[PDB]
Enzyme design. Structure first.
Site, PDB file in Angstrom:
ATOM      1  N   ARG A  13     -13.357   6.476  -9.213  1.00 16.95           N
ATOM      2  CA  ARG A  13     -13.086   6.162  -7.811  1.00 16.95           C
ATOM      3  C   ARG A  13     -12.832   4.673  -7.618  1.00 16.95           C
ATOM      4  O   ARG A  13     -11.941   4.287  -6.857  1.00 16.95           O
ATOM      5  CB  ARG A  13     -14.247   6.621  -6.922  1.00 16.95           C
ATOM      6  CG  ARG A  13     -13.995   6.459  -5.429  1.00 16.95           C
ATOM      7  CD  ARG A  13     -12.792   7.268  -4.963  1.00 16.95           C
ATOM      8  NE  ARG A  13     -12.676   7.279  -3.507  1.00 16.95           N
ATOM      9  CZ  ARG A  13     -11.556   7.025  -2.836  1.00 16.95           C
ATOM     10  NH1 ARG A  13     -10.435   6.736  -3.488  1.00 16.95           N
ATOM     11  NH2 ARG A  13     -11.558   7.050  -1.509  1.00 16.95           N
ATOM     12  N   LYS A  55     -10.334  18.100   4.933  1.00 21.21           N
ATOM     13  CA  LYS A  55      -9.003  18.510   4.492  1.00 21.21           C
ATOM     14  C   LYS A  55      -8.960  18.925   3.026  1.00 21.21           C
ATOM     15  O   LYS A  55      -8.095  19.698   2.626  1.00 21.21           O
ATOM     16  CB  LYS A  55      -7.988  17.390   4.725  1.00 21.21           C
ATOM     17  CG  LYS A  55      -7.985  16.307   3.655  1.00 21.21           C
ATOM     18  CD  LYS A  55      -6.823  15.349   3.875  1.00 21.21           C
ATOM     19  CE  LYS A  55      -6.638  14.403   2.699  1.00 21.21           C
ATOM     20  NZ  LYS A  55      -6.315  15.135   1.441  1.00 21.21           N
ATOM     21  N   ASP A 105       1.249   7.999  -6.780  1.00 22.59           N
ATOM     22  CA  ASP A 105       0.496   9.246  -6.917  1.00 22.59           C
ATOM     23  C   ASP A 105       1.410  10.480  -6.931  1.00 22.59           C
ATOM     24  O   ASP A 105       0.947  11.607  -7.136  1.00 22.59           O
ATOM     25  CB  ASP A 105      -0.523   9.380  -5.777  1.00 22.59           C
ATOM     26  CG  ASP A 105      -1.535   8.237  -5.748  1.00 22.59           C
ATOM     27  OD1 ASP A 105      -2.204   8.000  -6.777  1.00 22.59           O
ATOM     28  OD2 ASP A 105      -1.663   7.586  -4.689  1.00 22.59           O
ATOM     29  N   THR A 151       1.541   1.800  -3.654  1.00 25.84           N
ATOM     30  CA  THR A 151       0.407   2.408  -4.332  1.00 25.84           C
ATOM     31  C   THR A 151       0.259   3.891  -4.026  1.00 25.84           C
ATOM     32  O   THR A 151       0.037   4.690  -4.935  1.00 25.84           O
ATOM     33  CB  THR A 151      -0.913   1.663  -4.021  1.00 25.84           C
ATOM     34  OG1 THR A 151      -1.078   1.518  -2.607  1.00 25.84           O
ATOM     35  CG2 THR A 151      -0.888   0.289  -4.653  1.00 25.84           C
ATOM     36  N   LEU A 152       0.386   4.269  -2.758  1.00 28.78           N
ATOM     37  CA  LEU A 152       0.274   5.672  -2.382  1.00 28.78           C
ATOM     38  C   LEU A 152       1.352   6.509  -3.079  1.00 28.78           C
ATOM     39  O   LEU A 152       1.099   7.617  -3.544  1.00 28.78           O
ATOM     40  CB  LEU A 152       0.415   5.834  -0.863  1.00 28.78           C
ATOM     41  CG  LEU A 152       0.392   7.273  -0.338  1.00 28.78           C
ATOM     42  CD1 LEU A 152      -0.893   7.961  -0.780  1.00 28.78           C
ATOM     43  CD2 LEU A 152       0.506   7.265   1.195  1.00 28.78           C
ATOM     44  N   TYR A 186       0.798  -1.222   0.000  1.00 30.16           N
ATOM     45  CA  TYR A 186       0.000   0.000   0.000  1.00 30.16           C
ATOM     46  C   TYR A 186       0.838   1.283   0.000  1.00 30.16           C
ATOM     47  O   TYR A 186       0.338   2.350  -0.363  1.00 30.16           O
ATOM     48  CB  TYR A 186      -0.991  -0.008   1.169  1.00 30.16           C
ATOM     49  CG  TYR A 186      -2.048  -1.082   1.017  1.00 30.16           C
ATOM     50  CD1 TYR A 186      -2.818  -1.163  -0.141  1.00 30.16           C
ATOM     51  CD2 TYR A 186      -2.259  -2.038   2.017  1.00 30.16           C
ATOM     52  CE1 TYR A 186      -3.769  -2.172  -0.312  1.00 30.16           C
ATOM     53  CE2 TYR A 186      -3.214  -3.056   1.860  1.00 30.16           C
ATOM     54  CZ  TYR A 186      -3.962  -3.115   0.691  1.00 30.16           C
ATOM     55  OH  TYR A 186      -4.889  -4.116   0.512  1.00 30.16           O
ATOM     56  N   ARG A 202      -2.926  14.030   8.813  1.00 30.67           N
ATOM     57  CA  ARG A 202      -3.220  14.296   7.409  1.00 30.67           C
ATOM     58  C   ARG A 202      -4.672  14.714   7.174  1.00 30.67           C
ATOM     59  O   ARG A 202      -4.960  15.516   6.284  1.00 30.67           O
ATOM     60  CB  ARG A 202      -2.891  13.046   6.582  1.00 30.67           C
ATOM     61  CG  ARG A 202      -3.303  13.110   5.121  1.00 30.67           C
ATOM     62  CD  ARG A 202      -2.933  11.827   4.363  1.00 30.67           C
ATOM     63  NE  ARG A 202      -1.525  11.765   3.964  1.00 30.67           N
ATOM     64  CZ  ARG A 202      -0.512  11.499   4.782  1.00 30.67           C
ATOM     65  NH1 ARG A 202      -0.731  11.263   6.066  1.00 30.67           N
ATOM     66  NH2 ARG A 202       0.725  11.467   4.309  1.00 30.67           N
ATOM     67  N   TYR A 203      -5.586  14.178   7.976  1.00 33.92           N
ATOM     68  CA  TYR A 203      -6.998  14.497   7.824  1.00 33.92           C
ATOM     69  C   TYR A 203      -7.446  15.718   8.617  1.00 33.92           C
ATOM     70  O   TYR A 203      -8.571  16.190   8.467  1.00 33.92           O
ATOM     71  CB  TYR A 203      -7.824  13.252   8.149  1.00 33.92           C
ATOM     72  CG  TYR A 203      -7.432  12.111   7.234  1.00 33.92           C
ATOM     73  CD1 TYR A 203      -7.834  12.094   5.893  1.00 33.92           C
ATOM     74  CD2 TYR A 203      -6.563  11.115   7.671  1.00 33.92           C
ATOM     75  CE1 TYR A 203      -7.370  11.113   5.012  1.00 33.92           C
ATOM     76  CE2 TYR A 203      -6.092  10.141   6.803  1.00 33.92           C
ATOM     77  CZ  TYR A 203      -6.497  10.145   5.476  1.00 33.92           C
ATOM     78  OH  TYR A 203      -6.003   9.188   4.621  1.00 33.92           O
TER      79      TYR A 203
END
Ligand SMILES: [Mg+2]
Ligand SMILES: [Mg+2]
Ligand SMILES: [Mg+2]
Lengths: 353, 353
Positions: A181, A231, A99, A95-96, A92, A303-304
């Site tokens: 999405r 955010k 971006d 994957t992040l 993961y 982050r949020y």
């Protein structure tokens, strides 16, 4: 113009009640042990020279990305082994990180299939690292679950490609937003990675697992979208979120877009509970721990910025405000951990060694 | 139970009337030309000993499946080259064969990823033949469209796997029906295979192609769900269908399910027009030819047995029975072509030689 604080508060409390968000037997000490274990294996992995050279990512961003992902996995995949948490944390994070790339995939994908069929290393460096590491992830799963992770990761690559175009859909293209999405959500990867063959028999639980994937795909992406709404609200850099694409593609106000997301999220939450409450206890436990952990992760990860909301309604005597705060405090209670307690040493330090 | 013949007529008529069904993609001579070209190449391919050995299917079923697919391709991919039609006909014939098949993939998918990564032939014979043939299809497209075909075929494989369990979803599992339909629908494969690089520049039309894939995925599958309702209704292999899964999963009547489907289908149709009407004319043309040809194929091809319905309501004085029969006749006028005019010699005869 202003953030829909009360509407957001109401929806969030509803979401947590619907999923029966409550305390678990998953302790802080256990959390810390898992967090450090997953971080340590992943950190050493990304610090290897080959990884350091083929994965184009700013060191500080990689560090931050890895930490947020380890948190996500350790908190949401509560029942899997340490090894599984570590290996999923690596996948993961890959994957992040994709971006962060603005590079056009076209040139590196011209011979994708021929190289794949022939067993030659992929031209795109990301595929080279990811496909090389994949077996460390798949070994934890049966063939059906593995097929799902493989497909979802392939979809994700296409989703990142599409997003390089910063396209929210043509007005009137109602089917574009969810198509995108789902493409970028990693739903079937997440959904299927919740069932290690070490704890579950893929064939015996085929129906519950297949159903989990179908329902968790939407639950997970919509909850992420809803909890990321604060955010992203004023982020002029982020232009193509699901909600923003609803506005452009469906030609509706942001409020209506948010309403659509809220309705889908709440309904998804209820059907999750309704369907799995009476099924196998171990399956219901995994599903329930994912939902709760996933929410705690969003509530606790800076982050949020949800702490900003808690800080803005911390003393209001409103019902939702008070309920939100209680839930938030519940989350920080078990999720608020200092990175110095597990995320060390930094990847860059291990890389220099 | 009993087939909702009465409602079947109501819905079908509504769709055809709304899209204004009118097939004028070919002259009778051209249609015959393409059908024979596609059939002839596909027939010689499936007659090879390797193909005869690995593809486990009854000769008569293969023969009938090949003719049904040659018709689908030639009738709906009206603007691509004869070669593209032929190669696509082979690919889609492999998928239709799996589509009605009943096998357990599990044992031959255990080492799927490792063999793929090492470049070793796949254990499952279907993948062995499909991946070996794939380049003949992909050579017609750019990297983006190719990636879509690859993903959709892989999804399709998982879709047929799930169907092996004859599971229509748990009552209340609202997301299951469409989850499975997209999984088995081959939507992105079909949508992306409409843009050969010989006629379209994947980078110049990236946005319209991505949009077409997104919107056509649902139009395509929903239209088939509606029109193939008759032949699937009492077929054991097709008891797990979108319509019948809506009933089980959403706990609603077959009637409500059909209305739900036709409403989606009509909406999908409306947005297809609204979006592509004023876009690149070459794109709109390919889209129009697909929609009309796709309908023509469903009304004329044997697989869907719509003639049986014609031979029952032709006399009925209902307004729907009259609309349906007018359309069926209109479609047969252009699409009813005798197999003796193109489908020869039979695959079996080429195989024995
Ligand atoms: Mg099917
Ligand atoms: Mg079928
Ligand atoms: Mg069908």
């Amino acid at each position: 113009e202003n953030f829909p604080t009360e509407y957001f508060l109401n929806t969030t409390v509803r979401l947590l009640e619907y999923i029966r968000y409550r305390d678990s037997n998953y302790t802080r000490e256990e959390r810390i042990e898992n967090l450090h274990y997953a971080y340590n294996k992943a950190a050493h992995h990304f610090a290897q020279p080959r990884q350091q050279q083929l994965l184009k990512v700013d060191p500080k961003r990689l560090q931050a990305s890895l930490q947020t992902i380890v948190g996500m996995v350790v908190y949401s995949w509560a029942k899997v082994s340490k090894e599984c948490m570590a290996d999923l944390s690596i996948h993961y994070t890959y994957t992040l990180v994709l971006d962060d790339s603005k590079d056009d995939p076209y040139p590196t994908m011209v011979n994708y299939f021929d190289d794949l069929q022939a067993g030659r290393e992929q031209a795109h460096p990301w595929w080279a690292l990811v496909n090389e590491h994949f077996p460390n992830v798949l070994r934890h799963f049966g063939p059906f679950c593995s097929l799902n992770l493989i497909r979802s990761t392939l979809d994700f690559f296409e989703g990142c490609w599409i997003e390089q175009y910063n396209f929210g859909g043509f007005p009137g293209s109602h089917d574009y937003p969810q198509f995108l999405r789902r493409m970028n959500g990693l739903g079937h990867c997440v959904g299927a990675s919740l069932w290690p063959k070490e704890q579950f028999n893929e064939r015996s639980l085929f129906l519950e697992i297949t159903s989990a994937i179908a329902q968790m795909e939407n639950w997970m992406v919509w909850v992420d979208d809803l909890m990321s709404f604060y955010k992203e609200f004023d982020d002029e850099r982020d232009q193509i979120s699901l909600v923003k694409n609803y506005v452009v593609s469906d030609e509706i106000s942001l409020h209506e877009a948010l309403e659509k997301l809220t309705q889908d999220t709440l309904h998804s939450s209820k059907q999750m509970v309704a369907v799995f409450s009476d099924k196998d206890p171990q399956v219901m436990d995994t599903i329930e721990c994912f939902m709760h952990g996933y929410v705690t992760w969003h509530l606790c990860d800076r982050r949020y910025r949800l702490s900003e909301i808690y800080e803005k309604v911390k003393e209001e005597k409103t019902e939702d405000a008070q309920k939100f705060c209680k839930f938030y405090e519940q989350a920080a209670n078990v999720g608020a951990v200092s990175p110095s307690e597990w995320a060390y040493p930094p990847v860059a330090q291990l890389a220099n060694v």
